Design a binder for these strands. Structure first.
Ligand SMILES: *[C@@H]1O[C@H](CO)[C@@H](O)[C@H](O)[C@H]1NC(C)=O
Length: 168
RNA sequence: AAAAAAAAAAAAAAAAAAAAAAAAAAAAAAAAAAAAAAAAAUUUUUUUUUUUUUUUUUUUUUUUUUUUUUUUUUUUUUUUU
């Protein structure tokens, strides 16, 4: 099974077909990286309500439900790089107000519409790379009050314009 | 038909860090060798220059004995010119 070992559920290569929910729910760090994930269930995380951060990376997730942002209000790091994530919207980030770290290294998110990060105020680092972005625009209004580094690499942006960089 | 995430096999090529070895070369340290050389301590050869002892040849010198001649100073005696 997983490692636990004082609140670091580092679940290595273990042929875990489904997301487990074991007795040691009193942990803060959980790692779903390198685990067979069909999708993140909006209700299977009720047992683990103390997860400060979750390392659910490189998995196979079609889309993210908004409920995941309210089942774990105390969420800091959301490392979900190398997933399918064909399309995403702001609705799934409504309740993620405490989010501080985002990692999306391969998701093929070609088009981004509206303001997906209208509720993210403590989000520091943005990792949106190799997702085939054609433009650097992320919205029309002013958001991202407190962020430090913006990662937009390996995408297909053709030019930078004043109208698409005025959202900050 | 095509593109991608987790899970599993992998064959090839380019690189590397190690272990077990093996020839080759080069460094030394010990056992020998063949010699062209070097002394030293025991035998002795040839040759040159010189010392001592002993046996003898030639020449010279001294003394003694014997003997032949040139000179002799004496003549005891003998017949005399
Ligand atoms: C969520 O939990 C249920 C009950 O254990 C399980 O059948 C299901 O597979 C879980 N979800 C995923 C995506 O595995």
């Amino acid at each position: 099974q997983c490692t636990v070992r004082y609140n670091v559920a580092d679940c290595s290569h273990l042929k875990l077909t489904h997301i487990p929910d074991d007795l040691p729910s009193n942990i803060t760090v959980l790692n779903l990286t390198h685990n067979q994930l069909r999708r993140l269930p909006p209700t299977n995380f009720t047992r683990y309500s103390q997860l400060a951060i979750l390392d659910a990376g490189f998995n196979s997730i079609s889309k993210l439900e908004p409920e995941l942002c309210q089942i774990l209000p105390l969420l800091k790091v959301l490392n979900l790089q190398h997933n399918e994530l064909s399309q995403i919207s702001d609705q799934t980030f409504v309740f993620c107000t405490n989010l501080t770290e985002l990692d999306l290294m391969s998701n093929s998110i070609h088009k981004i519409k509206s303001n997906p990060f209208k509720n993210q105020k403590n989000l520091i680092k943005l990792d949106l790379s190799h997702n085939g972005l054609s433009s650097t625009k992320l919205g029309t209004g002013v958001q991202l009050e407190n962020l430090q580094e913006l990662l937009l690499a390996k995408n297909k942006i053709l030019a930078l314009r004043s109208e698409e960089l005025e959202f900050l």
